[PDB]
Amino acid sequence: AQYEDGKQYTTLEKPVAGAPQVLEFFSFFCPHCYQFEEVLHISDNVKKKLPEGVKMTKYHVNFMGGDLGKDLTQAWAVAMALGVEDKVTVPLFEGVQKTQTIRSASDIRDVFINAGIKGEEYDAAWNSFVVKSLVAQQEKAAADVQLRGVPAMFVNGKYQLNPQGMDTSNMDVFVQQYADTVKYLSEK
């Protein structure tokens, strides 16, 4: 076909029942994720071609950046619980990978403060149990798919995006091909 198993995607030998429709994994330590977010804007271009009523879920992972990596999974949980993902993603990426100003939970917290989340509000979420289950959801979802690399996208727990098999000469073309693939898999 135009879209082949092993080409633009692969198929999970052990499919994950009851999965989020479209499920993305990233790490703030992950360089390609930095590219996927800062340059390609993949999440955004995919959502813009997804059908009506398909929900998009994005989770952080622990297996990069040691102790700071888990902190980032917790703070991403805060971002989700407070609905401030769009306000912290970029300063977290640039603080970890560009400026090197994030070295501790506290520095992670500063990013939320500068973005206008209140100190009390952040510390409260950070320590909250709503956030703990958010951390657990993130972990369980990754565990569910044997995840060992990011960035990674899954559609309906059966299909995994394969960017390596798409042409990267032209970025806008790469992105469209990625988004279109997700749409195709979505309808499968």
Tab-separated table of C-alpha atoms in Angstrom:
chain	number	residue	atom	x	y	z
A	1	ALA	CA	0.000	0.000	0.000
A	2	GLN	CA	0.826	3.704	0.480
A	3	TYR	CA	0.891	3.158	4.269
A	4	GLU	CA	2.675	-0.072	5.254
A	5	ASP	CA	3.251	-1.857	8.529
A	6	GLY	CA	6.973	-1.428	9.208
A	7	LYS	CA	7.078	1.683	7.032
A	8	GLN	CA	5.333	4.736	8.538
A	9	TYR	CA	4.190	2.711	11.516
A	10	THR	CA	4.638	-0.668	13.287
A	11	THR	CA	2.044	-2.862	14.976
A	12	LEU	CA	2.162	-3.855	18.637
A	13	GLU	CA	2.426	-7.631	19.008
A	14	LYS	CA	0.706	-7.150	22.343
A	15	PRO	CA	-1.984	-4.508	21.690
A	16	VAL	CA	-3.079	-2.306	24.564
A	17	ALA	CA	-6.821	-2.429	25.244
A	18	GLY	CA	-8.612	0.647	26.592
A	19	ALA	CA	-5.782	3.018	25.626
A	20	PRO	CA	-6.064	6.757	24.992
A	21	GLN	CA	-7.019	7.342	21.357
A	22	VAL	CA	-3.840	9.264	20.521
A	23	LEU	CA	-1.063	8.885	23.063
A	24	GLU	CA	2.271	10.691	22.956
A	25	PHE	CA	5.403	10.194	25.101
A	26	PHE	CA	8.257	12.672	25.521
A	27	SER	CA	11.021	13.663	27.912
A	28	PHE	CA	12.261	17.173	28.560
A	29	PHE	CA	15.782	15.674	28.332
A	30	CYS	CA	15.020	14.174	24.893
A	31	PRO	CA	16.626	16.155	22.024
A	32	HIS	CA	14.309	14.976	19.260
A	33	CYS	CA	11.382	15.817	21.561
A	34	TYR	CA	12.822	19.317	21.764
A	35	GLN	CA	12.785	19.383	17.963
A	36	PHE	CA	9.234	17.811	17.875
A	37	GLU	CA	8.000	20.576	20.130
A	38	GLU	CA	10.024	23.688	19.370
A	39	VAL	CA	10.597	23.330	15.626
A	40	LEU	CA	8.141	20.818	14.194
A	41	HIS	CA	5.189	21.498	16.504
A	42	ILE	CA	4.098	17.898	15.895
A	43	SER	CA	1.399	17.671	18.647
A	44	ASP	CA	-0.245	20.715	17.232
A	45	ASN	CA	-0.192	19.682	13.610
A	46	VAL	CA	-1.514	16.245	14.448
A	47	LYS	CA	-4.433	17.625	16.480
A	48	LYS	CA	-5.248	19.880	13.492
A	49	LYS	CA	-5.833	16.886	11.210
A	50	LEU	CA	-7.460	14.542	13.663
A	51	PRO	CA	-11.164	13.781	13.218
A	52	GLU	CA	-13.909	15.131	15.362
A	53	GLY	CA	-13.938	13.752	18.895
A	54	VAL	CA	-10.472	12.203	19.027
A	55	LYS	CA	-8.705	13.106	22.277
A	56	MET	CA	-4.978	13.735	22.427
A	57	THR	CA	-2.922	12.651	25.452
A	58	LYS	CA	0.719	13.537	26.201
A	59	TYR	CA	2.821	11.953	28.938
A	60	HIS	CA	6.353	12.431	30.365
A	61	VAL	CA	8.721	9.481	31.091
A	62	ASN	CA	11.245	8.687	33.850
A	63	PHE	CA	14.029	6.854	32.003
A	64	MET	CA	15.936	10.005	31.034
A	65	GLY	CA	17.662	12.452	33.330
A	66	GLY	CA	17.837	10.462	36.542
A	67	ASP	CA	16.351	12.091	39.614
A	68	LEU	CA	15.500	15.187	37.618
A	69	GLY	CA	13.671	13.060	35.077
A	70	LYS	CA	11.198	11.799	37.720
A	71	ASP	CA	10.806	15.349	39.065
A	72	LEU	CA	9.860	16.356	35.562
A	73	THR	CA	7.258	13.569	35.379
A	74	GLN	CA	5.748	14.862	38.629
A	75	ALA	CA	5.779	18.526	37.462
A	76	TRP	CA	4.279	17.535	34.120
A	77	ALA	CA	1.538	15.960	36.233
A	78	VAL	CA	1.090	19.387	37.894
A	79	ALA	CA	0.969	20.977	34.440
A	80	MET	CA	-1.842	18.571	33.484
A	81	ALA	CA	-3.756	18.959	36.718
A	82	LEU	CA	-3.559	22.769	36.471
A	83	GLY	CA	-4.101	22.834	32.682
A	84	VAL	CA	-0.947	24.885	32.148
A	85	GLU	CA	0.847	22.547	29.672
A	86	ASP	CA	0.908	25.255	26.999
A	87	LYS	CA	2.571	27.703	29.390
A	88	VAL	CA	5.431	25.563	30.705
A	89	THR	CA	6.407	23.218	27.895
A	90	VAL	CA	8.720	25.631	26.144
A	91	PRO	CA	10.416	27.116	29.239
A	92	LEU	CA	10.948	23.602	30.603
A	93	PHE	CA	12.524	22.447	27.318
A	94	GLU	CA	14.768	25.486	27.058
A	95	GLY	CA	15.655	25.429	30.762
A	96	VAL	CA	16.761	21.779	30.505
A	97	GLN	CA	18.302	21.718	26.995
A	98	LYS	CA	19.196	25.307	26.010
A	99	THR	CA	20.071	27.475	29.017
A	100	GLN	CA	20.943	24.799	31.622
A	101	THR	CA	19.145	26.625	34.367
A	102	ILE	CA	17.160	23.632	35.531
A	103	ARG	CA	19.157	21.490	37.935
A	104	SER	CA	16.657	20.843	40.727
A	105	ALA	CA	12.996	20.505	41.539
A	106	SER	CA	13.177	24.102	42.744
A	107	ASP	CA	14.384	25.373	39.395
A	108	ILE	CA	11.490	23.441	37.792
A	109	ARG	CA	9.192	25.254	40.210
A	110	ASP	CA	10.637	28.666	39.171
A	111	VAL	CA	9.451	28.031	35.576
A	112	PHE	CA	5.865	27.672	36.811
A	113	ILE	CA	6.203	30.825	38.963
A	114	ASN	CA	7.544	32.926	36.108
A	115	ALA	CA	4.687	31.610	33.978
A	116	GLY	CA	2.298	32.908	36.606
A	117	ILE	CA	1.191	29.862	38.570
A	118	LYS	CA	1.019	30.930	42.230
A	119	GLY	CA	3.538	29.528	44.681
A	120	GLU	CA	0.869	28.143	46.949
A	121	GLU	CA	-1.066	26.753	44.040
A	122	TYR	CA	1.954	24.941	42.642
A	123	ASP	CA	3.227	23.500	45.948
A	124	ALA	CA	-0.278	22.360	46.708
A	125	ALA	CA	-0.611	20.450	43.434
A	126	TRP	CA	2.942	19.136	43.717
A	127	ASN	CA	2.120	17.490	46.997
A	128	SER	CA	-1.442	16.536	46.043
A	129	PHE	CA	-2.759	12.988	45.536
A	130	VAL	CA	-4.558	14.000	42.309
A	131	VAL	CA	-1.051	14.561	40.976
A	132	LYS	CA	0.205	11.198	42.346
A	133	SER	CA	-2.349	9.244	40.292
A	134	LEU	CA	-1.444	11.465	37.333
A	135	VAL	CA	2.170	10.330	37.861
A	136	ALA	CA	0.883	6.745	38.056
A	137	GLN	CA	-1.195	7.058	34.876
A	138	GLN	CA	1.913	8.346	33.042
A	139	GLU	CA	3.951	5.469	34.385
A	140	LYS	CA	1.330	2.799	33.801
A	141	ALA	CA	0.748	3.961	30.203
A	142	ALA	CA	4.419	3.709	29.375
A	143	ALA	CA	4.694	0.354	31.148
A	144	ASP	CA	1.733	-0.811	29.047
A	145	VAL	CA	3.688	-0.428	25.799
A	146	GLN	CA	7.231	-1.553	26.773
A	147	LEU	CA	8.334	2.017	26.084
A	148	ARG	CA	12.122	2.424	25.997
A	149	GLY	CA	12.510	5.378	23.673
A	150	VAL	CA	11.070	8.853	23.102
A	151	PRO	CA	9.622	10.648	21.284
A	152	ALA	CA	6.888	8.053	20.677
A	153	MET	CA	3.297	8.140	19.520
A	154	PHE	CA	0.684	5.410	19.775
A	155	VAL	CA	-2.767	5.296	18.191
A	156	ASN	CA	-5.513	3.145	19.845
A	157	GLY	CA	-2.939	0.991	21.609
A	158	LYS	CA	-2.206	-0.927	18.433
A	159	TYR	CA	-0.151	1.294	16.129
A	160	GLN	CA	3.116	3.056	16.802
A	161	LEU	CA	4.367	5.927	14.639
A	162	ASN	CA	7.646	5.347	12.800
A	163	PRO	CA	9.233	8.687	11.910
A	164	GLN	CA	12.502	7.052	10.790
A	165	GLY	CA	10.672	5.822	7.666
A	166	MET	CA	9.615	9.299	6.414
A	167	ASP	CA	11.636	11.813	4.403
A	168	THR	CA	13.322	14.612	6.358
A	169	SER	CA	14.640	16.803	3.519
A	170	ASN	CA	11.701	19.138	4.056
A	171	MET	CA	10.379	19.595	7.599
A	172	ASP	CA	6.918	20.858	6.699
A	173	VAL	CA	6.571	17.872	4.438
A	174	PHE	CA	7.854	15.581	7.186
A	175	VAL	CA	5.310	16.952	9.630
A	176	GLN	CA	2.386	16.667	7.186
A	177	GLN	CA	3.359	13.106	6.453
A	178	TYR	CA	3.486	12.371	10.191
A	179	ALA	CA	0.133	14.009	10.901
A	180	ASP	CA	-1.481	12.365	7.914
A	181	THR	CA	-0.198	8.987	9.051
A	182	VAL	CA	-1.767	9.468	12.496
A	183	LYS	CA	-5.066	10.412	10.837
A	184	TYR	CA	-4.909	7.323	8.651
A	185	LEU	CA	-4.117	5.074	11.641
A	186	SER	CA	-6.856	6.863	13.572
A	187	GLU	CA	-9.465	5.788	11.002
A	188	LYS	CA	-8.108	2.245	10.789
